[PDB]
Ligand binder design. Structure first.
Ligand SMILES: OC[C@H]1O[C@@H](O[C@H]2[C@H](O)[C@@H](O)[C@H](O)O[C@@H]2CO)[C@H](O)[C@@H](O)[C@H]1O
Ligand SMILES: [Ca+2]
Length: 225
């Protein structure tokens, strides 16, 4: 905390590497819906929700090779307490409309820095973003699918309205693929999933992950082979 974080990453040969992150989409129902108390579900506030509670309403979709402009800011919605259909950014490779007003998303895979140095990430959430990062915080090297819910204490915890903005700095090495797990929830209305970073020596933030997101084969033995 007085020094900067220096997380652990993974090694892999080039032949086991493909582009983009994996996405799972989960239902997050309203308590009740109006027209043709509070309406929204507080379950996302449960401490157990990020580790297993988030699957309890079932899934509805998934995609792979998620890459590029993965952030969004949907503040155009007009009606609350009501499902609103919209499409994810094309980065997600998911054509169907989702209940953008109310859904849960888990994004996982690997971050590779374009140069060795200190990276600062910034998240802005409506409603809820969790950020895990590193082979000892997000998931095990080459064992993502089996270990995806064994993440550690959060690297950033962003919740609307109060802690909605968070930041963190990690010194990362160019040659290494760092496990990354991004958890997102919208409970209702407006939806903001904004994840950006300032690369080393860079003043302007970027929200474009193109060339930074990769997937490794889940071949196990800490990627030996
Ligand atoms: O301001 C973002 C915040 O809005 C809440 O939704 C409100 C909505 O703004 C209001 O127009 C409607 O009448 O009631 C809603 C609350 O029941 C969201 O709940 C919150 O998640 C954010 O989206
Ligand atoms: Ca919301």
């Amino acid at each position: 905390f007085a020094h900067y974080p220096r997380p652990e990453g993974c090694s892999s040969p080039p032949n086991a590497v493909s582009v983009g992150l994996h996405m799972d989409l989960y239902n997050y129902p309203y308590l009740y819906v109006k027209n043709p108390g509070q309406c929204w579900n507080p379950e996302y506030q449960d401490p157990n929700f990020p580790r297993y509670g988030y699957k309890k309403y079932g899934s509805f979709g998934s995609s792979d090779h998620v890459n590029g402009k993965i952030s969004w800011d949907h503040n155009e919605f007009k009606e609350g307490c009501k499902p609103i259909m919209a499409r994810l950014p094309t980065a997600y490779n998911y054509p169907a409309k989702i209940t953008f007003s109310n859904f849960t998303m888990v994004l996982s895979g690997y971050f590779k820095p374009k140069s060795t140095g200190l990276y600062k990430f910034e998240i802005h959430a409506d409603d809820f973003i969790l950020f895990n990062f590193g082979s000892k915080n997000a998931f095990e090297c080459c064992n993502r699918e089996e270990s995806i819910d064994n993440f550690g204490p959060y690297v950033a915890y962003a919740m609307w309205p109060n802690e909605a903005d968070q930041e963190l700095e990690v010194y990362l090495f160019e040659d290494s693929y760092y496990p990354i797990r991004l958890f997102y929830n919208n409970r209702e209305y407006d939806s903001k999933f904004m994840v950006g970073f300032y690369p080393p020596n860079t003043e302007e933030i970027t929200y474009d992950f193109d060339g930074y997101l990769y997937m490794l084969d889940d071949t196990g033995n800490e990627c030996k082979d």
